[PDB]
Symmetry: C5
C-alpha cells in the first residue's frame, strides 16, 4: 500500500507544518482558461481556472532508491493537512467533478508537495455607467486564507508577474479585454488580525463605432431634416404643418427603440443627454412656423417674399447645433 | 492528537452548557459583504455575509503552559454542541464550500469559543408601488433560534449598535441604500413559547431625475404641442385635422413605450394617472376643432376673423393644465 | 448519554407503533409563512410553511422524577420510526438546512411526540383564462402518506379548522388572496388501496380598475374619435381620407401594445373580443366615406347640403355600439 | 429485527435471480401525474409520474403463520438486487425526496416483490414547424435497461394497454393533448447486443381560431382597404398618395408585431408566406396610381371620366386575391 | 460473493497497471445521443453522450470453467483503478443517476475491462458574427487525462474514424449540422509535461432564404418606393412632401424591428451595412425635392415642363443602387 510509505497514522494532520514556530510560506500560480459570462444589471462576471499550490512538509518524506515521485487523487486530501484558500467577494463557486473530482497531489521524496484543482467562480464588480457608451471598467479577483493569519501562513505569488498565464483565445462577445496583471496587499480584520491578499486585475472596453452608427447618426439626420421647412414657401400650410409633426413622431419612435436595446440601468447617461437635446431642437422648429403663420395672417387681415424669421432661422439653428456638438464632445471626449 | 486535549468522549454534547439551570447567553456580530440582487416582481433581495457567535463552555477547557488557543475547521462541529440559528422569512440559503467549508472554531484555554461562517441568503420584502416613481421601501433580515426558548438560550447583540459593519463599496444598480441599524424584539409561538429575535434594517430610494426626464417631459411637450392648432387659420381644414390625429397617435406610442419599460406590477400608480390625464387633454383638443368646423359650415350655408371658441380655448386649456399640475404635485410631493 | 434513556437498541423501529392491531392516529397542524411566486404560463405556485405532527409511541417512554421533556435535532430521526408524508401533485420541494437542518423532535415522559420541520414546495394549479381579466381561480395543496393505507395509519386534522394559521402580511404582487380553509377526502389506488388525503384551499382575484383604464378606455376613445368625420364637409377630401387611415393605424398600434403586455396564453379571451369588434367599427367608418365620395362624383359628372348617408350614419353608428356594449357587459358581468 | 427474517447475509445480491439460466421477466406499470412544461425553441417536454416494477425472487421468501406482507422504505434497496431502468433520450431527471425518499418495497411471503417510486423527467421531442399554425406533433417517452440484454432480463408491459393510466385533469396551456397509447420494440447496440425498449406515445394540437383571428384577419382587412383608392377621383392627388403610403406603413407595423409574438424559429412557415404575399399586393396598389397620374399629366400637357387602368384594376385585383386564397387553402388544408 | 473471485484486498489499486514500466494504452469510443441547446450570446453548446473505455489489467483475472464474463454497477468503481478522463474547456457537466447511477463495468476472465457511462456536458465555442447572416461556425469537444502524462498513460481512438457514431435524428432548431470527424494532438503543460488530447469536430450553417425574405426584401422595396416621387408633378407640394417624410418613418420602423429580433451582439455586421446604406438613399430622395421646390419658387418670383433635376435623378438613383448591390454581393458572396 502506497499510503503506508507515508506514516499517516504517526502524525497529527490537524496542525500545520512548523507549528509553534515561524510561518510556513505557500506559493501560488494561476492559469485562466476562459471568461464565461458577464451581467451588467447584477454587476458580476464568471471565470474558469486552474489553481496550484506549493509548500514543503517533512512529515510526508519517504525513502526511495530513485528520484521518482508519487501521485494521488482527491481521496488523500482528507487524510493530510492542506491550505484553506477561498475567494473574497464571490457570490457562488464549485469544483468540477466529471468523470471524477478534478484534484491531485504530487509528493517528492523530500516532502515537497504540489496541489492542483480546477474551479469556476462568480465574482462581484462595481460598474459606473455615467459615460456610456464611452465608459471603461476595471475588475479583479481576490484570493485569501480563511483561518490563518500572517503569523502562521505566508501567502505569496510564486514567480512574481510570471505566475499568471491566460488562454490565447479568451474573449467576450460585447467587450474587449486588456492588461492582465497581479498585485498584493495586507488586509485587517478586527476579529482576528492581519491577512495577506492576492489580486488579479484586468480592463474592459466597448466597440465605439457600432454605437455611433446605431444611435448618434439617425438623431443627427432627423435634426438636419427638420431644417428643410425653412426653405419651403410659407403659403403652403398643408405642407409645412404635417412635415413638422411627422418629424416629431419619427424622433420619438427612434428614442423609444434605442431605450429598448440598452441595459436596464435607471440613471442618466451621456447618450440620453444627446438624444433629448436633439428632441428639443425638433420641437422648437415647429414653434417657429406657428409664429410665422400667425403673423402673416394678422398682416393680411389688417391690410384688407421671405419672412424675416425664416431668414434668421436658416442661420441660427445650425450654428447653435454645431456649438452644442463642440461643447459635448470636448466634455465627453 | 489535539482532539484528545478536549475530553470529547467524557461528555454528552447533545445537551446545552448549563443544562438544568439559567439560560446560556450567546452574543452575535455581523459583517455584510455585498448586496447581490433584488427582484421587484417577486419582492425579495439577496445578501452575502459573515456570522459570528460567542459563548463559554467549561467542558472544553484544556491545560496549557501558555495562553495560546487552538483552531479547528468544520469537521469538529459535529462532535460538540453549537447554537442552531436560522433566518426567519427566507426563501433559500447556503453555506459556501470552496475550496473547503468556510467554517471555523477557536477555543481559548478557559473554554471561550468563537464560531464563524460565511453564508448567502434570499429574504422576502413586501413592497408598495402606489407612489412610483417617488416611493420609499424598508427591508429587514431576521435571526432566531430554531429549538431553544428564552428560558434555555438568551440571544443578544454583543456590542449593541457597534455589532454591525458594512462594506465601503456596497451598492445596487437601480437603488440608493441608506440608514443601516439594528433592533431586537420578542416573538411568541403557541406551539412552544417565547423567543428572542434580532433585526437588521435599511432603506431604499430611486433616482428621481432619470424618471422625470424619461416620462414626464415628453408628455408635457406633446400637450403643449396640441395647443398650436388654436392659432392656425380655421379655413385650413387639411392642415388642422391631420395635426390633431397625428398628435393622438404620438401620445399613444409614448404611453405604450413607457408601459413596456416599467416592472410588471398590475395596479394603478401615480405616473399612470399623469399620463392618462395628458391623453384626455389631447383628445379634447380634437373635439374642439370638430365643433368649430361644423358651426362655420352651418353659418355659410345659412348665409348663401377668429371664432369665439378658439379665443376662449387659447386661455382656458393652459390654465386648467396648470391647475391640475398644482394639485398633483401638492398631493404626491 | 440521553439516547440511552430511550432503549433505542431494544426495539425494531422499522415497524410502526401498534403493529398488527388497529391503525395509529396521526394529527397534523400547518402554519403558512409566505407565498413566494406564481407562474401563469406554467400554471403553478410556490409556498413556504411549517409542518407539525403528533402521535404516541410507548416504546419511547422514559423514567423521570419530574415532568420535563427531552429535545433532539434531526440526527435522531434516522434511529426511530416517523410518519412518511409527501405532497401530491407537486413539481419540486426541499427542506431548509441553514445553519443546520430545520428539524426537531420533542418527547414527553409518557411517549408523546411532536415532530416539526420547515419546507418550501411548488405545486400545480390548472387555470382557465376564458374570462380574463374578470376571471377567478381556485388552488389547493394536498398532503398524503406514501406507503401506509388507512388500515395502518389514520391521518386527520388535529383541531379541525383551527389547525390552519396564516401570516398577517401574506400577499402577492398581481393578485388578491381570500378564503383559506381545509377539507379531507378518501382516495383510491388500484395498486394498493384506500388513503386519507388533506387539502388547503384558497382563491385569487385581479384588480379590475387597472385593466379597465389600461385597455377598455383607449379603444372606446378611438371609436368615438372615428365618428367626428361624419360632421366634416364632404368636399374636403384631403381632410376626410387621412383622418380615417390614421385612426386605423392608431388602433392597430394600441392592439399590438396590449398584446405585448399580457401573459402568453394562445386562445381567445374576452378582452380580445372587445378589441377586435372596436377595430371592425373603425374599418367600417372608412368604407362609409368611400361610398359617399364616389356617389357625389357620379352626380356631378352626370349633371355636367348634407348627403343622406352621413345623416343616417350620425345616428346609426353610436346606437349599434351602445347595443354591443349592453350585450357584452350582460354576458361577461 | 425484520431484516433478519430475510437472510440478507446468506446470499450474494450482486447477481440476478435465476443467474446462469433463463432470463427473469420484469413487468412494468406507469401512472402519469402531470405535464409540467414544454419548450418549443429547445424542443423538449417535462413530465411527473409513478413507476412500478413486478418480479419474483425465491431468496427473499420468509416463513409466516399468516398471509401478511412486509413493507420497507428506500434504505433496504442498497441491500438487495433491483432492476436498473433508465430513460432513453432524456436531458435531466431526479427522484423526489420530501419529506423522505419517495420509494418503497413490498415483499410477499413467497418472494413476490413490488417496487414503486416517484420521478420527474425532461425528454427530447423533434418538432417540425413548416405548417405552423396548422402543424401536428408526436412525442414519446422511452424506458430501457442499462446493463442487461434480453438474454438475462425480459422487460414487458404487465397488462398490455391497460398498464398506462393518466390523470383526469392533465393539460397544457397552449396545446390540446390526445391519443395516449403504448408500444414495444427491440433495439441493437454493437457494443453489447439486443435490448427491449418500451414507449409511451401522445399527440399535440393548437387552437386554430385564435391564430386565424390574430393574424389572418387584419392582413385581409388591410388588403381590402387598399382597394378603396380605385373608386376615388384621380384628380385628388393629395388624397390618393397619402392613403397608399399610410396603408403600406400599417401593414409593415402589423407584420413586425406578429413576428414579435411567435416562437423564435428561423425558417419559413406558412403564415409568413400569407403575410408577405399580402404585402406585395399593397405595394402594387401604389404603383398603379403612380402610372395613372403620370399618364394624365402627359395628356394634359400635350393637349395644351374614369381612366381605363382604374376600370380594369377594380376587377383584376380582387379576382387574383381570391385565386391566391383558393390555391393556398387547398395546399395547406 | 462475486467480489471475492477478484482478489480485491490482495492488490494496491491506488497505482496503475504496469506501474514502473511502459505506459498502459487506453482506447476510447463515443456515441452522441443529442444536441440539447446553443447560446449565441454566451458562446457555448450542450451535448449528451455515451463514453466507453477499454484496457487490460492482469490483477482482475479470475478462474472460470467457461468463457462467461461478470458485470458490476458503479459501486465497484471505488474499489479498483480506473482512468481519470475530463473535458477540456467545459463550463459544467454531470453524470445521470436515475433510477440509479448510469455506470457499469464488465470484466473478462483474462482481465479485459469495458467501462461505460452516460454524461451531459456544456462546452465553450468562440464565434464570429462579422458575416451574419452568411457566417459559418466550427465547434469542438476535447477529452484529456487529468493526472497522467504520455509516459504513464497512452490515450487513443480505438478504431480510428469508426470510433464515432451519431444519432440519426440529431438536429438544432436554428442551425444545420454537418461534417462530424475526429482528430488527435499533443499538448504541453509547463507544470507537468506532455499529454494526449482527442477532438470531436463539426460545422454549423443557417437558413439563408428566411433571412433574405425577412430583412433584405422590405428594405429594397422601400428604396424602390422612394423613387416614385420623381414622376409626380412638381407643383403638387402637399403630395410630394408627406410621401418622403412617411417613407423615412417606415424605413426607421423596419430597422428598429429588425434590430429587436437578432441576437444581442454589439458590433457591426453585414446586414447593418445594407440597412443603413438603404436609409441614406431614402434621405437623399427628400433633399432632392427640397432643392427643386426652392429653385422653382425663385424663378417664379424673379419672373413676376419637367425640371432638369428630376430628369437626371430618374436615371442616376437606380444605377447607383445597382452598382452598390454588385459590389456588396461580390464582397460578401
Ligand atoms: C538531484 C537529485 O535528487 N538526485 C538524485 C540522486 O541524489 C539519487 O542518488 C538518484 C537515485 O537514482 O536520484 C537522483
Ligand atoms: C491574562 C492571561 O491569561 N495571562 C496568562 C497568564 O496567566 C499565564 O501565566 C501566561 C503563561 O505564559 O499566559 C498569559
Ligand atoms: C399532570 C402531570 O404530569 N403531573 C406530574 C406529576 O404526576 C409528577 O409527580 C410531577 C413530578 O414533579 O410532575 C408533574
Ligand atoms: C391463497 C393464500 O395464500 N392463502 C393463505 C393460506 O394458505 C394460509 O394458510 C393462511 C394463513 O392464515 O393465509 C392465507
Ligand atoms: C476463445 C476462447 O476464449 N475460448 C474458450 C475456451 O478456451 C474454453 O475452453 C471454453 C470453456 O467452455 O470457453 C471458450
Ligand atoms: C507586474 O507588472 C505590473 C505592471 O503594471 C505591476 O503593476 C506589478 O507591480 C508587477 N508585479 C510584480 C510582482 O512584479
Ligand atoms: C442603534 O441606533 C438606532 C438608530 O436609529 C436605534 O434605533 C437603535 O435602537 C440603536 N440600538 C442600540 C442597541 O443602541
Ligand atoms: C372549515 O370551514 C370551512 C368553511 O367553508 C368548511 O368548508 C369546512 O368543512 C370546515 N372544516 C371543518 C373541519 O370544520
Ligand atoms: C394498444 O392500443 C394501441 C391503439 O392504437 C395499439 O397501437 C397498441 O398496439 C396496443 N397495445 C397493446 C399491447 O395492445
Ligand atoms: C477521419 O476522417 C477525417 C476526414 O476529414 C480526417 O480529417 C481524419 O484525419 C480521419 N481520422 C482518422 C483517424 O482516420
Ligand atoms: C443629474 C446628473 C446631471 C445630468 C444633467 C443632464 C441634464 C439634461 C437636460 C436635457 C434637457 C432636454
Ligand atoms: C383605484 C385607486 C384610485 C386611483 C384613481 C385614479 C383615477 C384615474 C383617472 C384617470 C382618467 C384618465
Ligand atoms: C372560439 C370560442 C368562441 C369565441 C368567439 C369569438 C368571436 C370573435 C369575433 C370577433 C370578430 C372581429
Ligand atoms: C424555401 C422553402 C419554400 C418556401 C417558398 C416560399 C416563397 C415565398 C415567396 C413570397 C414572396 C413575397
Ligand atoms: C468598423 C468595421 C468596418 C465596418 C465599416 C462599415 C461602414 C458602414 C457605413 C454605413 C454608412 C451609412
Ligand atoms: C476562527 C476563525 C475566524 C476567521 P474571521 O475572523 O471571521 C476572518 C475570515 C477572513 N479571513
Ligand atoms: C420541537 C421544536 C419545535 C419548534 P416550533 O414550536 O415549531 C418554533 C420554531 C421557530 N422558533
Ligand atoms: C409499496 C408501496 C406502493 C405505494 P403506491 O401503490 O404506488 C401508492 C403511492 C401513493 N399513496
Ligand atoms: C458494461 C455495460 C455496457 C452497456 P452499453 O453497451 O453502453 C449499452 C447501454 C444502453 N442499454
Ligand atoms: C499533480 C497533477 C497536476 C496536473 P496539472 O499540471 O495541473 C495538468 C492538468 C491537465 N492535464
Ligand atoms: C460635429 C462634430 C464636431 C465635434 C468633433 C470633436 C471636436 C471636439
Ligand atoms: C408645472 C409645475 C408646477 C408645480 C410645481 C410644484 C408646486 C406644488
Ligand atoms: C357603455 C356601458 C353600458 C353597459 C354597462 C353595464 C350594463 C349591463
Ligand atoms: C377566402 C377563402 C376561400 C378559401 C376557402 C377554402 C377553399 C379551399
Ligand atoms: C440586385 C442583385 C444583383 C447582385 C447579384 C449578385 C451579383 C454578384
Ligand atoms: C422658436 C422660434 C420661435 C420664433 C419666434 C420669434
Ligand atoms: C431664430 C429666430 C429668430 C427670430 C428673428 C428675430
Ligand atoms: C452632464 C454635463 C453634460 C453637459 C452637456 C454638454
Ligand atoms: C372640448 C371643447 C368643445 C368645444 C365646444 C364648445
Ligand atoms: C374652451 C372652449 C369654451 C367654448 C367657448 C364658450
Ligand atoms: C359601411 C357603410 C357604407 C355606406 C354605404 C351605404
Ligand atoms: C349607416 C349608413 C346607412 C346608409 C343610409 C341608407
Ligand atoms: C363568446 C361570446 C361573446 C359574445 C360577444 C358579446
Ligand atoms: C401594378 C399596376 C401598374 C399599372 C400599369 C398598367
Ligand atoms: C390591372 C391593371 C391593368 C391595366 C389595364 C390594361
Ligand atoms: C441629393 C440631390 C440634391 C439635388 C441638388 C442638385
Ligand atoms: C441626381 C441629381 C443630379 C442633379 C442634376 C445636375
Ligand atoms: C466592410 C466592407 C463592406 C463594403 C460595403 C460594400
Ligand atoms: Cl393636403
Ligand atoms: Cl390640400
Amino acid at each position: 500500500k502506497s499510503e503506508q510509505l507515508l506514516r499517516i497514522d504517526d502524525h497529527d494532520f490537524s496542525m500545520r507544518p512548523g507549528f509553534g514556530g515561524p510561518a510556513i510560506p505557500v506559493g501560488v500560480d494561476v492559469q485562466v482558461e476562459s471568461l464565461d459570462s458577464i451581467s451588467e444589471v447584477d454587476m458580476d462576471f464568471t471565470m474558469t481556472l486552474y489553481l496550484r499550490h506549493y509548500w514543503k512538509d517533512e512529515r510526508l518524506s519517504f525513502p526511495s532508491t530513485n528520484n521518482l515521485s508519487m501521485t494521488f487523487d482527491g481521496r488523500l486530501v482528507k487524510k493530510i493537512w492542506v491550505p484553506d484558500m477561498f475567494f473574497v467577494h464571490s457570490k457562488r463557486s464549485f469544483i468540477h467533478d466529471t468523470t471524477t473530482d478534478n484534484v491531485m497531489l504530487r509528493v517528492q521524496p523530500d516532502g515537497k508537495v504540489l496541489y492542483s484543482l480546477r474551479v469556476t467562480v462568480t465574482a462581484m464588480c462595481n460598474m459606473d455607467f455615467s459615460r456610456f457608451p464611452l465608459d471603461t471598467q476595471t475588475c479583479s479577483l481576490e484570493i485569501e486564507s480563511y483561518a490563518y493569519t500572517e503569523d502562521d501562513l505566508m501567502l505569496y505569488w510564486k514567480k512574481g508577474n510570471d505566475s499568471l498565464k491566460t488562454d490565447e483565445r479568451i474573449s467576450l462577445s460585447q467587450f474587449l479585454i486588456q492588461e492582465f496583471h497581479t498585485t498584493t496587499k495586507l488586509a485587517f480584520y478586527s476579529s482576528t488580525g492581519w491577512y495577506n491578499r492576492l489580486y488579479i486585475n484586468f480592463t474592459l472596453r466597448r466597440h465605439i463605432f457600432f454605437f455611433l452608427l446605431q444611435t448618434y447618426f439617425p438623431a443627427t439626420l432627423m435634426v438636419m431634416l427638420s431644417w428643410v421647412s425653412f426653405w419651403i414657401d410659407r403659403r403652403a400650410v398643408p405642407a409645412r404643418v404635417p412635415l413638422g409633426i411627422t418629424t416629431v413622431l419619427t424622433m420619438s419612435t427612434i428614442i423609444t427603440g434605442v431605450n429598448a436595446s440598452m441595459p436596464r440601468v435607471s440613471y442618466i447617461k451621456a447618450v440620453d443627454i444627446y438624444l433629448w437635446v436633439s428632441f428639443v431642437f425638433v420641437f422648437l422648429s415647429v414653434l417657429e412656423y406657428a409664429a410665422v403663420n400667425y403673423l402673416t395672417t394678422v398682416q393680411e387681415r389688417k391690410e384688407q417674399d421671405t419672412h424675416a424669421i425664416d431668414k434668421y432661422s436658416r442661420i441660427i439653428f445650425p450654428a447653435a447645433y454645431i456649438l452644442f456638438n463642440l461643447i459635448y464632445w470636448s466634455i465627453f471626449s
